[PDB]
Symmetry: C3
Subunit: 114 residues, 3 copies
C-alpha cells in the first residue's frame, strides 16, 4: 500500500514519529506486511477545502486489494483520527481517494506484482 497526505499544516507541526505511526497502523488496518507499506507526507501546501484555507488534507491510499466499502470506511476512521490527533485537522476537511490497483499495474523491484 501507498498512503500520501498533502496538507497546508506547516512542517513544524508534523510530530516526530508520524511516518512510523502511519506505517504501523496501515499495516494493521490493511493486513499487509509493514515492509510493503509506503507513506508520504507533504506539508506547507497551498490548498483550500470548501473555499477555506483552515487546516485541511488531500490524501490517497493505493493498495493491491483490501479496498472496498467497509474497509474504506474503516481506513477513513483510522486516518482521519490520526490527522485530527497529530496534525489537528478536522475530519470534515479531509478527502482520501482510495484506489484498488491491479497487480499488473504496480511496478516494484524491476517488475510488477502480476
Amino acid at each position: 500500500p501507498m498512503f500520501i497526505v498533502n496538507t497546508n499544516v506547516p512542517r513544524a507541526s508534523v510530530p516526530d514519529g508520524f511516518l512510523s505511526e502511519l506505517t504501523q497502523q496501515l499495516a494493521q488496518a490493511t493486513g499487509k506486511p509493514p515492509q510493503y507499506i509506503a507513506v508520504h507526507v507533504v506539508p506547507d501546501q497551498l490548498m483550500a477545502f470548501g473555499g477555506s484555507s483552515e487546516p485541511c488534507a488531500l490524501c490517497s491510499l493505493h493498495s493491491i486489494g483490501k479496498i472496498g466499502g467497509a474497509q474504506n470506511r474503516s481506513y477513513s476512521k483510522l486516518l482521519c483520527g490520526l490527522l485530527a490527533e497529530r496534525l489537528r485537522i478536522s475530519p470534515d476537511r479531509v478527502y482520501i481517494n482510495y484506489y484498488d490497483m491491479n497487480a499488473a499495474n504496480v511496478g516494484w523491484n524491476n517488475s510488477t506484482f502480476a
Copy 2:
C-alpha cells in the same frame, strides 16, 4: 470535487485570490456546492513538457460523478483558460487527468461518501 495543479511557474507568479477563483469556477462547472470543492496548487516544480521547461502544468480533477466526454471537454476549456490567464501557461502545455470516483472510494469525515 478536488482539483490539483502542479506547475513549474514560481510561487510569486500565482496571483492573490487564485484558490478562491478555482473554487468558485469549479463549483459552477461541476454544479457542486463550493463547500465540497477542494483545490491545491503546487508551484516551483521541476518539470518538463514535450522536452522543454517553459511554463507547463500537470493536473488532476477527481469527482464523484460529473465526469464524462462532454463535461471533461468543458472542464478543460475552463481550466486551461484559467491557467493561461492567471499563470501564463499555454493550453498546449497542460495535461488534466479526470477521475470519476466511486462514492465508496472517497473518504471524508471518518467514513466514505457511500
Copy 3:
C-alpha cells in the same frame, strides 16, 4: 504519457539532464513522440518505504494506451534502472503506479484527447 517521481533523495543529487533523459527514454519505451511526454521530479520528500527513510521513490506513469502486463514489466525494469543509476535508489524501494487513461479522461489544449 506523464511520469512523476516523488523521492526523499535531495535536489542536489538529481543530475542535470535527468528530465531530458526521462523524456527520451519514455518516448522510446512508449513509442510516443517526445512532444507528448511530460515528466515531473519531486525531491526532498518526507517519505518512508517499509518504515525506512533510506532512499525510495513513489512514481506514476499515466498514458492513453501503451499500458498492460508485459509493457508495465518492461517500463518497471527501465525506470527502476534509471532511478538506481541516476538517483541511487534500490529497485526494491520503488513503487510505480500505472494508469491506462481513457482519451476522454485526459484534458489538453482546451479539450480532451477523445
